């Protein structure tokens, strides 16, 4: 409720929706970057291994990109140490292009912003 | 010529430049003029413990130093 309310105030400047398993796996594998550095000195680094994942989470037994996907899809007990550990994805512009960034995805006229629900997988894998 | 009489423009932006600071929240505040005849009694309370503690410590020091 809290984050949905705080995101509704920013809805006209974003588009969001259901990620689904294949898309979360694609995002983590080919666009996943991780903060390996020390606290407040994070030094963004691509995953490329499981050593840093284990170093930050091995004592908390969620070591491995296997486990990170196993955990990000079904929001289990560790989302703090996954989302915050994961660097913000820097996506490419869409391959085929946006429809209208100025208008909502939900208006009858073509538009982009809003909740695409399950329709964001195509946009993500087009932007990836 | 006429001068800009007043405007609040840019003011809260200037405020948030360094942010809206907050009181430092000290644990103890002075009670210089706060309810006399009660904190005077508290002052009298403190000396009661102080005198016994001091005499006990001095006697222990003398008995241990011979």
């Amino acid at each position: 409720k809290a984050t949905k309310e705080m995101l509704k105030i920013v809805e006209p400047y974003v588009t969001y929706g259901y990620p689904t398993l294949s898309t979360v796996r694609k995002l983590l594998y080919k666009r996943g970057y991780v903060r390996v550095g020390k606290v407040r000195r994070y030094a963004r680094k691509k995953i490329q291994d499981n050593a840093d994942i284990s170093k930050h989470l091995g004592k908390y037994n969620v070591h491995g990109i296997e486990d990170m996907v196993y955990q990000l899809y079904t929001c289990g007990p560790v989302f703090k140490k996954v989302n915050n550990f994961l660097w913000a994805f820097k996506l490419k512009p869409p391959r085929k292009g946006f429809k209208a960034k100025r208008h909502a995805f939900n208006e009858p006229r073509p538009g982009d912003w809003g909740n695409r629900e399950a329709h964001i997988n195509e946009l993500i894998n087009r932007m990836i | 010529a006429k001068s800009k009489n007043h405007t609040n423009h840019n003011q809260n932006r200037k405020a948030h430049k360094n942010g809206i600071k907050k009181p430092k929240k000290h644990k103890f505040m002075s009670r210089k003029g706060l309810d006399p005849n009660f904190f005077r009694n508290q002052k009298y309370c403190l000396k009661g413990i102080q005198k016994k503690k001091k005499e006990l410590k001095l006697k222990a020091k003398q008995e241990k130093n011979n």
């Binding site: 409720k1 809290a2 949905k4 | 200037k14 405020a15 600071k21 907050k22 009181p23």
Partner: protein, 155 residues
């Protein structure tokens, strides 16, 4: 050109409908303690100890208590920072806060729940649930009970 003490308080300090008259009998019968959160609400029927222009409806800690007055610590925002201010008002203009009763029952809950949980050695969390997504459950909707509606045209 007019910045008096009561300027701009035509409706803020006006008495509500049916609420005219002095304060109730047992309004004088609240146990106020030091360091107590309290709301400061102006009562125009009582003129001495009237709260000042801006602090009506605010909330703050009690730092002073006198025979018929209360000193309240209220943070006020000016320009680029918030600073503490000590306002001394009479007790008819003071109403006990309803911020700490939200946790009074929680802290009584702790001493009865966490105690038994530890002594029996379970792990149970106590943080607020901030409930969002509803869980998954098996339901039974009746084929007779299910009814259909539809939209309407212009008229």
């Amino acid at each position: 050109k007019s910045r008096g003490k009561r300027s701009g308080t035509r409706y803020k300090f006006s008495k509500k409908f049916r609420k005219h008259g002095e304060c109730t009998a047992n309004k004088y019968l609240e146990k106020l303690n030091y360091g107590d959160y309290v709301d400061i609400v102006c009562d125009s029927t009582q003129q001495k100890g009237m709260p000042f222009n801006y602090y009506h409806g605010k909330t703050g800690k009690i730092f002073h208590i006198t025979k018929r007055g209360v000193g309240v610590l209220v943070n006020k925002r000016v320009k680029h920072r918030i600073e503490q201010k000590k306002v001394c008002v009479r007790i008819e203009h003071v109403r006990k806060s309803r911020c700490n009763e939200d946790f009074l029952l929680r802290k009584i809950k702790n001493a009865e729940l966490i105690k038994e949980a530890k002594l029996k050695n379970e792990h149970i969390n106590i943080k607020r649930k901030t409930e969002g997504p509803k869980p998954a459950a098996m339901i039974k909707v009746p084929p007779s009970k299910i009814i259909t509606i539809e939209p309407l045209p212009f008229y």
